[PDB]
Amino acid sequence: SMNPPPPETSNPNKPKRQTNQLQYLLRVVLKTLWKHQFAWPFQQPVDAVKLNLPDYYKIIKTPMDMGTIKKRLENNYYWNAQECIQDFNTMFTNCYIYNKPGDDIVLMAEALEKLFLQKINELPTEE
Numbered sequence: 001s002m003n004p005p006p007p008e009t010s011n012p013n014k015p016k017r018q019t020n021q022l023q024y025l026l027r028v029v030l031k032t033l034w035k036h037q038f039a040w041p042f043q044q045p046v047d048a049v050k051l052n053l054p055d056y057y058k059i060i061k062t063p064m065d066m067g068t069i070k071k072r073l074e075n076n077y078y079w080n081a082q083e084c085i086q087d088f089n090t091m092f093t094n095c096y097i098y099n100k101p102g103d104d105i106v107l108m109a110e111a112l113e114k115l116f117l118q119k120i121n122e123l124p125t126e127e
């Protein structure tokens with residue numbers, strides 16, 4: 001069994017910038033989700049080998065996790081807030097695609113997603 005390489009977190013070929021919105025995504029959004037009691041499954045890529053999930057990376061072809069997002073934000077990898085919001089949405093959606101309704105991990109994702117929605121609702125206007 002083998003895991004894929006993780007999503008990239010650095011690429012000199014990719015345009016990037018700092019924006020006040022991206023700063024909020026790190027300081028408010030990421031930080032709020034990261035400290036949550038239910039964050040831990042999402043703090044790093046799914047280890048399909050150790051979890052014995054050999055079909056995971058057949059079903060989930062665009063993996064994403066908050067460890068990757070955190071590094072992307074700390075590295076200023078993004079051009080805009082939408083790119084980062086899309087990564088969060090991919091992460092939640094992947095969990096719902098792979099798992100069953102009412103599974104613990106789905107309840108965890110829902111708790112994080114509720115906070116994510118609350119925080120992104122107050123994403124500042126771009127400066």
Ligand SMILES: Cc1sc2c(c1C)C(c1ccc(Cl)cc1)=N[C@@H](CC(=O)Nc1nncs1)c1nnc(C)n1-2
Binds near residue numbers: 040046047051099105
């Ligand atoms: C470190 C990680 S990452 C992760 C998980 C763990 C431990 C777990 C998980 C399970 C319960 C709780 Cl309380 C918390 C987490 N769920 C897997 C799916 C899975 O294991 N399905 C199975 N089907 N029967 C046998 S195991 C999963 N799906 N997305 C993510 C992200 N995970």
